[PDB]
């Protein structure tokens, strides 16, 4: 988990402000919005990166372009690339990062309102974050469903096929015969109802806090290039302080910056280390990491 700063520039002062805000608003909570950047330190291979075995396996299987692996039409025409990706990225193959544990720490301190994640690694949940506080915007491998009729299936049959050599005779629905796949949201598919429903509730929650425990929304490791998830930042109340911890300034933080926006160019794990330091929760955090 060892981390280092992205550059010679120190982000400790910027992180100090966050800790200061939380110290001034002790009964406040934080909403996190996270992306693939928070799992990079976990060693998860990026399917879009030529340096990975996953990318080359997909290329050899004749996948047209990386994101076609998450395309419904392509999947129906050829499920092998996706099965191949699922074998390598199946939840449980990796371990949570220091940042994932930070979410658990905030939960323990009761300062976590919600974590909206567009990742499908389920690492927030694996790290101990409670189901009620997690919004897996793009689904997960916890359930499987028929892409045709929607019949639900336990995730085990699909997972069992990933261990066969070679992978063939893909899982089909016992009702309509169409392909069954993990409950992951593919491009072109709608997100689970809980996404919009919970954001509707947390949006009112945010606004009501403004008029008095001022909240904080921290966006971490996401390029904000996938909608509707990417619409969340701009929908945050102007009177609610936004924080962006990302190697680059992206999305609404770039297009329409706000006076109170706090941008922190830092690795998520280093950010976690620094924030825990400024909050003085090193002891409790150390316990979690060693647990």
């Amino acid at each position: 988990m060892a981390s280092m700063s992205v550059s010679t520039a120190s982000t400790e002062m910027s992180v100090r402000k966050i800790a200061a805000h939380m110290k001034s608003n002790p009964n406040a909570k934080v909403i996190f919005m996270v992306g693939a950047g928070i799992s990079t330190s976990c060693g998860i291979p990026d399917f879009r990166s030529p340096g990975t075995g996953l990318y080359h396996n997909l290329a050899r299987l004749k996948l047209p372009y990386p994101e076609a692996v998450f395309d419904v039409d392509f999947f129906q025409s050829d499920p092998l690339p996706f099965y191949t990706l699922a074998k390598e990225l199946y939840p449980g193959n990796f371990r949570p990062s220091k940042f994932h544990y930070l979410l658990k720490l905030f939960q323990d301190k009761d300062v976590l309102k919600r974590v909206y994640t567009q990742n499908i690694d389920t690492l927030e949940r694996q790290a101990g974050v409670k189901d009620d506080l997690i919004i897996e915007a793009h689904g997960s491998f916890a359930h499987c469903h028929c892409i045709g009729c929607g019949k639900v299936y336990p995730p085990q049959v699909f997972k069992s096929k990933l261990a066969e050599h070679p992978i063939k005779d893909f899982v089909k629905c016992d009702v309509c015969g169409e392909l069954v796949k993990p409950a992951i949201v593919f491009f072109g598919e709608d997100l689970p109802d809980s996404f919009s429903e919970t954001w509707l509730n947390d949006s009112e929650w945010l606004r009501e806090k403004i008029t008095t425990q001022q909240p904080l929304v921290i966006v971490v490791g996401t390029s904000l290039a996938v909608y509707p998830f990417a619409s969340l930042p701009e929908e945050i109340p102007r009177k609610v302080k936004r924080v962006l911890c990302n190697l680059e300034t992206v999305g609404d933080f770039k297009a329409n910056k706000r006076p109170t926006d706090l941008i922190v160019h830092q690795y998520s794990d280093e950010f976690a280390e620094q924030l825990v330091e400024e909050l003085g929760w090193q002891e409790d955090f150390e316990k979690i990491l060693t647990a």
Partner: peptide, 8 residues
């Protein structure tokens, strides 16, 4: 509700 998963 936002629509289907997509870019842009």
């Amino acid at each position: 509700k936002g629509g289907a998963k997509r870019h842009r």
